[PDB]
Amino acid sequence: SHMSKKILIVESDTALSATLRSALEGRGFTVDETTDGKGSVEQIRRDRPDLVVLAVDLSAGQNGYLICGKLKKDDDLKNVPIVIIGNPDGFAQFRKLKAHADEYVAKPVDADQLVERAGALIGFPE
Ligand SMILES: [Cl-]
């Protein structure tokens, strides 16, 4: 009963992104990943994932709160669901801002909670 549902993981912890990618693929999602936080907004514009998993603390001084802020202010990208993963200390503050994520999963992330959250936002694919 499979139907295509695409996820992009923006994460420079590539061990974690591999773990999450495998877990999501196990439920039938089509999954890509990138370490390129700087390019991520434009990659989302190009590739049009159905959901993005976005880390807070990215390489090269990139920051998932800033990236999500940009996505949510972009009239053509602000409807893409975003799950932020990271140190949970900042999540409540982010929720109070106008431009914020759709869901949050604390690091250390359990791949099951992340898969659960993705499925609850866009449905499973099969
Ligand atoms: Cl992080």
Numbering used by the authors: -1 to 124
Q: Which statements did the authors publish about this structure?
A:
The Myxococcus xanthus FrzS protein transits from pole-to-pole within the cell, accumulating at the pole that defines the direction of movement in social (S) motility. The N-terminal receiver domain (RD), a 258-residue coiled-coil domain, and the extreme C-terminal tail of the protein are all required for the dynamic subcellular localization and S-motility activity of FrzS. Here we show using atomic-resolution crystallography and NMR that the FrzS receiver domain (RD) displays the conserved switch Tyr102 in an unusual conformation, lacks the conserved Asp phosphorylation site, and fails to bind Mg2+ or the phosphoryl analogue, Mg2+·BeF3. The crystal structures of the mutants suggested that the observed conformation of Tyr102 in the wild-type FrzS RD is not sufficient for function. These results support the model that FrzS contains a novel ‘pseudo-receiver domain’ whose function requires recognition of the RD output face but not Asp phosphorylation.
To test whether the environment of Tyr102 is important for domain function, we mutated His92, which forms a hydrogen bond to the buried Tyr102 hydroxyl group in the FrzS RD structure, to a phenylalanine. The His92Phe mutation blocked social motility to the same extent as the Tyr102Ala mutation with no effect on protein stability. The His92Phe mutant crystallized in a distinct monoclinic space group (P21), with one crystal contact within 4 Å of the α4-β5-α5 output face, as quantified by the Crystal Contacts Analysis Server. In total, the intermolecular contact area decreased from an average of 4806 Å2/RD-monomer in the hexagonal crystals to 1594 Å2/monomer in the monoclinic His92Phe RD crystals. The His92Phe replacement was expected to cause the Tyr102 side chain to switch to the outward facing rotamer due to the increased volume of Phe and the loss of the hydrogen bond between Tyr102 and the His92 side chains. Unexpectedly, Tyr102 remained facing inward in the structure of the His92Phe variant, and the Phe92 side chain shifted away from Tyr102. The overall Cα RMSD for the His92Phe variant and hexagonal wild-type RD structures was 0.35 Å. In summary, the His92Phe RD structure is nearly identical to the hexagonal wild-type RD structure in both the dynamic β3-α3 loop and the output face of the RD. The similarly inactivating His92Phe mutation, however, preserved the conformation of Tyr102 in the crystal structure of the mutant protein. Rather, the His92Phe mutation may compromise an alternative conformation of the α4-β5-α5 face or interrupt a signalling pathway required to switch the conformation of Tyr102 and to retain FrzS at the leading pole during S-motility.
